[PDB]
Design a protein around this motif. Sequence first.
Motif, mmCIF file in Angstrom:
data_model
loop_
_atom_site.group_PDB
_atom_site.id
_atom_site.type_symbol
_atom_site.label_atom_id
_atom_site.label_comp_id
_atom_site.label_asym_id
_atom_site.label_seq_id
_atom_site.Cartn_x
_atom_site.Cartn_y
_atom_site.Cartn_z
ATOM 1 N N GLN A 1 -79.629 27.976 -85.375
ATOM 2 C CA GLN A 1 -78.894 29.036 -85.708
ATOM 3 C C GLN A 1 -77.345 28.532 -85.306
ATOM 4 O O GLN A 1 -76.486 29.138 -86.045
ATOM 5 C CB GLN A 1 -79.409 30.410 -84.821
ATOM 6 C CG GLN A 1 -78.284 31.453 -85.232
ATOM 7 C CD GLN A 1 -78.346 31.835 -86.727
ATOM 8 O OE1 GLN A 1 -79.549 32.420 -87.208
ATOM 9 N NE2 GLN A 1 -77.054 31.755 -87.605
ATOM 10 N N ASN B 1 -76.105 26.559 -88.153
ATOM 11 C CA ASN B 1 -75.869 27.545 -89.603
ATOM 12 C C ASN B 1 -74.498 28.230 -89.422
ATOM 13 O O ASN B 1 -73.677 28.432 -90.007
ATOM 14 C CB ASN B 1 -76.889 28.452 -89.731
ATOM 15 C CG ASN B 1 -78.033 27.586 -90.551
ATOM 16 O OD1 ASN B 1 -77.528 26.929 -91.499
ATOM 17 N ND2 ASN B 1 -79.236 27.540 -90.276
ATOM 18 N N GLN C 1 -71.266 28.549 -91.378
ATOM 19 C CA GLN C 1 -70.499 29.721 -92.026
ATOM 20 C C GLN C 1 -69.020 29.986 -91.629
ATOM 21 O O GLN C 1 -68.426 30.373 -92.273
ATOM 22 C CB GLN C 1 -71.594 30.823 -91.541
ATOM 23 C CG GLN C 1 -72.968 31.094 -91.991
ATOM 24 C CD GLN C 1 -72.820 31.434 -93.518
ATOM 25 O OE1 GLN C 1 -72.142 31.996 -94.114
ATOM 26 N NE2 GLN C 1 -73.751 30.548 -94.289
ATOM 27 N N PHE D 1 -80.577 23.976 -93.242
ATOM 28 C CA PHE D 1 -79.117 23.874 -93.126
ATOM 29 C C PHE D 1 -78.623 24.207 -94.682
ATOM 30 O O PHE D 1 -77.690 24.187 -95.047
ATOM 31 C CB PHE D 1 -78.520 22.677 -92.707
ATOM 32 C CG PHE D 1 -78.735 22.486 -91.138
ATOM 33 C CD1 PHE D 1 -78.965 23.598 -90.531
ATOM 34 C CD2 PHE D 1 -79.115 21.261 -90.999
ATOM 35 C CE1 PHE D 1 -79.452 23.467 -89.167
ATOM 36 C CE2 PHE D 1 -79.436 21.097 -89.558
ATOM 37 C CZ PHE D 1 -79.805 22.236 -88.582
ATOM 38 N N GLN E 1 -79.048 26.489 -97.286
ATOM 39 C CA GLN E 1 -78.344 27.565 -97.828
ATOM 40 C C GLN E 1 -76.810 27.670 -97.436
ATOM 41 O O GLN E 1 -75.898 27.774 -98.035
ATOM 42 C CB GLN E 1 -79.009 28.960 -97.364
ATOM 43 C CG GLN E 1 -78.575 30.139 -98.171
ATOM 44 C CD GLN E 1 -79.343 31.182 -98.053
ATOM 45 O OE1 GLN E 1 -80.655 31.157 -98.323
ATOM 46 N NE2 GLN E 1 -78.763 32.467 -97.632
ATOM 47 N N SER E 2 -76.762 27.391 -96.095
ATOM 48 C CA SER E 2 -75.460 27.421 -95.521
ATOM 49 C C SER E 2 -74.344 26.276 -96.051
ATOM 50 O O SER E 2 -73.250 26.526 -96.381
ATOM 51 C CB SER E 2 -75.402 27.268 -94.136
ATOM 52 O OG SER E 2 -75.886 28.550 -93.335
#
Length: 110
Positions: A7, A10, A14, A47, A49-50
């Motif tokens: 987390q 990510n 972001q 990782f 998608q980010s």
Amino acid sequence: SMDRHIQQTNDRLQCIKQHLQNPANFHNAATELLDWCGDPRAFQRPFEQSLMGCLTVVSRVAAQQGFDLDLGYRLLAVCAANRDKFTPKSAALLSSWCEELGRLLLLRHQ
């Protein structure tokens, strides 16, 4: 270690995504991301998608006025070199975005 606090990584990605949108922060944010993509462990599904969210912003902004097109292109080139680690739709997008940035970069040097 990369996968002990997924987390956190990510959340960092972001934050980088947000800063890539801003011409005053693109240099540092895109450099962060290029450094991160130089670690072969970065290319893993937790990782992805980010990372694609970041790269999406790079595809859009790199050739805009006030942004660094060559840094954007170098970043997309590393990811394109690893595109077979992504989904097939994402791999096709990376190839497309990299090539488009390269065309734009060529045009400036012609």
